[PDB]
Design a protein around this nucleic acid. Structure first.
Ligand SMILES: CCCCCCCCCCCC[N+](C)(C)[O-]
Length: 74
DNA sequence: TGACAATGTCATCCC
DNA sequence: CAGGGATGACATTGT
């Protein structure tokens, strides 16, 4: 199969959570993660970029569906 | 491997 | 605040 780059990222950077986790975990969850873990700044930054992408791709989705839904047919 | 579809990324605006 | 939803353009990936 295959992995996301963000998964590779998280992995390369030894993040205590997964890309998937990162992006889907709830905010309060994430916050625990962040108050409890030793995370360089780079790792912190990373986690934020990952979540961004992570939420945006989902978002990209819909859009398109709506895009594609709304015109293509209806 | 090359076409064509599909997904992801990023910049921006928004709330 | 901040985080995060929309969407348009461009990029990478999948089949
Ligand atoms: C959707 C659920 C995602 C939230 C998962 C949180 C689990 C992270 C725990 C990592 C543990 C690492 N450590 C430092 C405690 O050993």
């Amino acid at each position: 199969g295959r992995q996301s780059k963000d998964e590779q990222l998280a992995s390369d950077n030894e993040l205590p959570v997964s890309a998937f986790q990162i992006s889907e975990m709830s905010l309060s969850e994430l916050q625990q993660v962040l108050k409890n873990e030793s995370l360089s700044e780079y790792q912190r930054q990373l986690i934020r970029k990952i979540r961004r992408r992570g939420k945006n791709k989902v978002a990209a989705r819909t859009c398109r569906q709506r895009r594609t839904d709304r015109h293509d047919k209806m």
